[PDB]
PDB file of all heavy atoms in Angstrom:
ATOM      1  N   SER A1502     185.272  95.574 105.738  1.00  0.00           N
ATOM      2  CA  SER A1502     184.943  94.831 107.036  1.00  0.00           C
ATOM      3  C   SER A1502     184.818  93.358 106.761  1.00  0.00           C
ATOM      4  O   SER A1502     185.024  92.599 107.693  1.00  0.00           O
ATOM      5  CB  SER A1502     183.743  95.394 107.684  1.00  0.00           C
ATOM      6  OG  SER A1502     182.520  95.088 106.940  1.00  0.00           O
ATOM      7  N   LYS A1503     184.450  92.881 105.566  1.00  0.00           N
ATOM      8  CA  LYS A1503     184.279  91.464 105.162  1.00  0.00           C
ATOM      9  C   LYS A1503     185.442  91.066 104.322  1.00  0.00           C
ATOM     10  O   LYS A1503     185.378  90.261 103.443  1.00  0.00           O
ATOM     11  CB  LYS A1503     182.998  91.324 104.426  1.00  0.00           C
ATOM     12  CG  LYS A1503     181.757  91.577 105.264  1.00  0.00           C
ATOM     13  CD  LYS A1503     180.506  91.386 104.525  1.00  0.00           C
ATOM     14  CE  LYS A1503     179.341  91.668 105.349  1.00  0.00           C
ATOM     15  NZ  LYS A1503     178.004  91.506 104.622  1.00  0.00           N
ATOM     16  N   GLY A1504     186.689  91.616 104.703  1.00  0.00           N
ATOM     17  CA  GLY A1504     187.909  91.321 103.990  1.00  0.00           C
ATOM     18  C   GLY A1504     188.193  92.287 102.887  1.00  0.00           C
ATOM     19  O   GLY A1504     187.482  93.275 102.680  1.00  0.00           O
ATOM     20  N   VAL A1505     189.339  92.047 102.241  1.00  0.00           N
ATOM     21  CA  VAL A1505     189.723  92.938 101.135  1.00  0.00           C
ATOM     22  C   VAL A1505     189.131  92.346  99.846  1.00  0.00           C
ATOM     23  O   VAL A1505     189.328  91.237  99.494  1.00  0.00           O
ATOM     24  CB  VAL A1505     191.337  93.059 101.072  1.00  0.00           C
ATOM     25  CG1 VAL A1505     192.016  91.738 101.144  1.00  0.00           C
ATOM     26  CG2 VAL A1505     191.705  93.841  99.814  1.00  0.00           C
ATOM     27  N   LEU A1506     188.369  93.247  99.157  1.00  0.00           N
ATOM     28  CA  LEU A1506     187.774  92.788  97.934  1.00  0.00           C
ATOM     29  C   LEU A1506     187.923  93.868  96.871  1.00  0.00           C
ATOM     30  O   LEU A1506     188.540  94.933  97.109  1.00  0.00           O
ATOM     31  CB  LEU A1506     186.213  92.624  98.130  1.00  0.00           C
ATOM     32  CG  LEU A1506     185.731  91.394  98.853  1.00  0.00           C
ATOM     33  CD1 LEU A1506     186.399  90.057  98.458  1.00  0.00           C
ATOM     34  CD2 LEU A1506     185.770  91.562 100.377  1.00  0.00           C
ATOM     35  N   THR A1507     187.324  93.674  95.672  1.00  0.00           N
ATOM     36  CA  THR A1507     187.426  94.591  94.474  1.00  0.00           C
ATOM     37  C   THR A1507     186.111  95.294  94.311  1.00  0.00           C
ATOM     38  O   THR A1507     185.142  94.856  94.931  1.00  0.00           O
ATOM     39  CB  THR A1507     187.896  93.886  93.300  1.00  0.00           C
ATOM     40  OG1 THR A1507     187.776  94.898  92.168  1.00  0.00           O
ATOM     41  CG2 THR A1507     186.999  92.837  92.870  1.00  0.00           C
ATOM     42  N   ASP A1508     186.117  96.271  93.484  1.00  0.00           N
ATOM     43  CA  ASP A1508     184.972  97.056  93.130  1.00  0.00           C
ATOM     44  C   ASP A1508     183.702  96.366  92.823  1.00  0.00           C
ATOM     45  O   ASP A1508     182.565  96.819  93.033  1.00  0.00           O
ATOM     46  CB  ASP A1508     185.303  98.119  92.016  1.00  0.00           C
ATOM     47  CG  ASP A1508     185.767  97.413  90.739  1.00  0.00           C
ATOM     48  OD1 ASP A1508     185.988  96.220  90.763  1.00  0.00           O
ATOM     49  OD2 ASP A1508     185.799  98.161  89.752  1.00  0.00           O
ATOM     50  N   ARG A1509     183.797  95.201  92.085  1.00  0.00           N
ATOM     51  CA  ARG A1509     182.667  94.388  91.671  1.00  0.00           C
ATOM     52  C   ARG A1509     181.976  93.701  92.857  1.00  0.00           C
ATOM     53  O   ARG A1509     180.783  93.972  93.192  1.00  0.00           O
ATOM     54  CB  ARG A1509     183.105  93.310  90.660  1.00  0.00           C
ATOM     55  CG  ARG A1509     183.642  94.006  89.380  1.00  0.00           C
ATOM     56  CD  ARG A1509     182.541  94.640  88.538  1.00  0.00           C
ATOM     57  NE  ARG A1509     182.938  94.893  87.148  1.00  0.00           N
ATOM     58  CZ  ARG A1509     183.514  95.991  86.715  1.00  0.00           C
ATOM     59  NH1 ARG A1509     183.728  96.984  87.539  1.00  0.00           N
ATOM     60  NH2 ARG A1509     183.959  96.054  85.450  1.00  0.00           N
ATOM     61  N   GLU A1510     182.709  92.857  93.524  1.00  0.00           N
ATOM     62  CA  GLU A1510     182.201  92.103  94.664  1.00  0.00           C
ATOM     63  C   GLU A1510     181.901  92.975  95.870  1.00  0.00           C
ATOM     64  O   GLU A1510     181.026  92.675  96.701  1.00  0.00           O
ATOM     65  CB  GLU A1510     183.078  90.983  95.037  1.00  0.00           C
ATOM     66  CG  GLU A1510     184.513  91.250  95.116  1.00  0.00           C
ATOM     67  CD  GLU A1510     185.427  90.047  95.060  1.00  0.00           C
ATOM     68  OE1 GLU A1510     184.857  88.919  95.072  1.00  0.00           O
ATOM     69  OE2 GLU A1510     186.617  90.156  95.040  1.00  0.00           O
ATOM     70  N   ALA A1511     182.557  94.213  95.960  1.00  0.00           N
ATOM     71  CA  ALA A1511     182.181  95.011  97.089  1.00  0.00           C
ATOM     72  C   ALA A1511     180.900  95.838  96.781  1.00  0.00           C
ATOM     73  O   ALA A1511     180.293  96.370  97.716  1.00  0.00           O
ATOM     74  CB  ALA A1511     183.382  96.153  97.357  1.00  0.00           C
ATOM     75  N   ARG A1512     180.501  95.914  95.541  1.00  0.00           N
ATOM     76  CA  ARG A1512     179.274  96.525  95.131  1.00  0.00           C
ATOM     77  C   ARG A1512     178.181  95.531  95.147  1.00  0.00           C
ATOM     78  O   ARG A1512     177.004  95.886  95.354  1.00  0.00           O
ATOM     79  CB  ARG A1512     179.442  97.123  93.663  1.00  0.00           C
ATOM     80  CG  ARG A1512     178.411  98.069  93.259  1.00  0.00           C
ATOM     81  CD  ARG A1512     178.458  98.455  91.792  1.00  0.00           C
ATOM     82  NE  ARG A1512     179.725  98.988  91.450  1.00  0.00           N
ATOM     83  CZ  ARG A1512     180.087 100.311  91.401  1.00  0.00           C
ATOM     84  NH1 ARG A1512     179.179 101.196  91.807  1.00  0.00           N
ATOM     85  NH2 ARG A1512     181.264 100.787  91.060  1.00  0.00           N
ATOM     86  N   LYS A1513     178.568  94.252  95.061  1.00  0.00           N
ATOM     87  CA  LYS A1513     177.572  93.127  95.156  1.00  0.00           C
ATOM     88  C   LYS A1513     177.246  92.917  96.584  1.00  0.00           C
ATOM     89  O   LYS A1513     176.126  92.756  96.997  1.00  0.00           O
ATOM     90  CB  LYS A1513     178.212  91.892  94.491  1.00  0.00           C
ATOM     91  CG  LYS A1513     178.262  91.948  93.023  1.00  0.00           C
ATOM     92  CD  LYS A1513     178.822  90.616  92.423  1.00  0.00           C
ATOM     93  CE  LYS A1513     178.973  90.672  90.963  1.00  0.00           C
ATOM     94  NZ  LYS A1513     177.693  90.823  90.187  1.00  0.00           N
ATOM     95  N   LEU A1514     178.317  92.922  97.461  1.00  0.00           N
ATOM     96  CA  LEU A1514     178.067  92.665  98.880  1.00  0.00           C
ATOM     97  C   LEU A1514     177.513  93.915  99.537  1.00  0.00           C
ATOM     98  O   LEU A1514     176.737  93.891 100.442  1.00  0.00           O
ATOM     99  CB  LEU A1514     179.338  92.203  99.639  1.00  0.00           C
ATOM    100  CG  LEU A1514     179.703  90.726  99.753  1.00  0.00           C
ATOM    101  CD1 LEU A1514     178.636  90.014 100.545  1.00  0.00           C
ATOM    102  CD2 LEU A1514     179.872  90.053  98.382  1.00  0.00           C
ATOM    103  N   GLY A1515     178.023  95.065  98.956  1.00  0.00           N
ATOM    104  CA  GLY A1515     177.555  96.338  99.514  1.00  0.00           C
ATOM    105  C   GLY A1515     178.219  96.757 100.831  1.00  0.00           C
ATOM    106  O   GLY A1515     177.449  96.782 101.794  1.00  0.00           O
ATOM    107  N   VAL A1516     179.498  96.853 100.903  1.00  0.00           N
ATOM    108  CA  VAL A1516     180.211  97.223 102.034  1.00  0.00           C
ATOM    109  C   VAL A1516     181.002  98.476 101.930  1.00  0.00           C
ATOM    110  O   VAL A1516     180.759  99.520 102.688  1.00  0.00           O
ATOM    111  CB  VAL A1516     181.099  96.080 102.612  1.00  0.00           C
ATOM    112  CG1 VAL A1516     180.269  95.075 103.283  1.00  0.00           C
ATOM    113  CG2 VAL A1516     181.749  95.327 101.313  1.00  0.00           C
ATOM    114  N   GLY A1517     182.045  98.616 101.017  1.00  0.00           N
ATOM    115  CA  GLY A1517     182.819  99.737 100.955  1.00  0.00           C
ATOM    116  C   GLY A1517     183.872  99.907 102.048  1.00  0.00           C
ATOM    117  O   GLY A1517     183.775  99.196 103.113  1.00  0.00           O
ATOM    118  N   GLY A1518     184.753 100.809 101.849  1.00  0.00           N
ATOM    119  CA  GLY A1518     185.810 100.974 102.865  1.00  0.00           C
ATOM    120  C   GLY A1518     187.004 101.763 102.372  1.00  0.00           C
ATOM    121  O   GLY A1518     186.800 102.825 101.719  1.00  0.00           O
ATOM    122  N   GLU A1519     188.208 101.372 102.777  1.00  0.00           N
ATOM    123  CA  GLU A1519     189.417 102.046 102.396  1.00  0.00           C
ATOM    124  C   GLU A1519     189.819 101.689 100.993  1.00  0.00           C
ATOM    125  O   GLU A1519     190.337 100.622 100.779  1.00  0.00           O
ATOM    126  CB  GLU A1519     190.510 101.772 103.425  1.00  0.00           C
ATOM    127  CG  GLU A1519     191.779 102.558 103.245  1.00  0.00           C
ATOM    128  CD  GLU A1519     192.865 102.203 104.305  1.00  0.00           C
ATOM    129  OE1 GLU A1519     192.666 101.367 105.152  1.00  0.00           O
ATOM    130  OE2 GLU A1519     193.950 102.908 104.243  1.00  0.00           O
ATOM    131  N   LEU A1520     189.761 102.638 100.015  1.00  0.00           N
ATOM    132  CA  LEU A1520     190.173 102.470  98.729  1.00  0.00           C
ATOM    133  C   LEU A1520     191.674 102.338  98.566  1.00  0.00           C
ATOM    134  O   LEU A1520     192.368 103.413  98.651  1.00  0.00           O
ATOM    135  CB  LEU A1520     189.647 103.545  97.753  1.00  0.00           C
ATOM    136  CG  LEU A1520     189.944 103.380  96.265  1.00  0.00           C
ATOM    137  CD1 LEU A1520     189.297 102.099  95.697  1.00  0.00           C
ATOM    138  CD2 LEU A1520     189.433 104.544  95.529  1.00  0.00           C
ATOM    139  N   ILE A1521     192.227 101.144  98.528  1.00  0.00           N
ATOM    140  CA  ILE A1521     193.732 100.902  98.482  1.00  0.00           C
ATOM    141  C   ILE A1521     194.401 101.460  97.243  1.00  0.00           C
ATOM    142  O   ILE A1521     195.185 102.283  97.285  1.00  0.00           O
ATOM    143  CB  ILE A1521     194.087  99.493  98.713  1.00  0.00           C
ATOM    144  CG1 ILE A1521     193.428  98.959 100.058  1.00  0.00           C
ATOM    145  CG2 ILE A1521     195.552  99.340  98.699  1.00  0.00           C
ATOM    146  CD1 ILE A1521     194.010  99.783 101.311  1.00  0.00           C
ATOM    147  N   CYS A1522     194.025 100.816  96.110  1.00  0.00           N
ATOM    148  CA  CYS A1522     194.717 101.145  94.835  1.00  0.00           C
ATOM    149  C   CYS A1522     193.854 100.890  93.619  1.00  0.00           C
ATOM    150  O   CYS A1522     192.690 100.292  93.665  1.00  0.00           O
ATOM    151  CB  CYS A1522     195.896 100.326  94.682  1.00  0.00           C
ATOM    152  SG  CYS A1522     195.671  98.488  94.773  1.00  0.00           S
ATOM    153  N   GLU A1523     194.308 101.368  92.463  1.00  0.00           N
ATOM    154  CA  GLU A1523     193.656 101.253  91.148  1.00  0.00           C
ATOM    155  C   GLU A1523     194.617 100.657  90.101  1.00  0.00           C
ATOM    156  O   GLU A1523     195.804 100.984  90.202  1.00  0.00           O
ATOM    157  CB  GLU A1523     193.037 102.614  90.599  1.00  0.00           C
ATOM    158  CG  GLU A1523     194.156 103.687  90.282  1.00  0.00           C
ATOM    159  CD  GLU A1523     193.547 104.980  89.791  1.00  0.00           C
ATOM    160  OE1 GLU A1523     192.275 105.039  89.714  1.00  0.00           O
ATOM    161  OE2 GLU A1523     194.335 105.909  89.488  1.00  0.00           O
TER     162      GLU A1523
END
Side-chain angles (χ1 to χ4, degrees):
Chain A
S1502 67
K1503 295 179 180 180
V1505 49
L1506 287 314
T1507 174
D1508 60 349
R1509 296 291 194 266
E1510 47 196 356
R1512 195 186 301 271
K1513 289 182 183 292
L1514 269 297
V1516 278
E1519 186 178 3
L1520 183 61
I1521 304 299
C1522 58
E1523 63 179 3

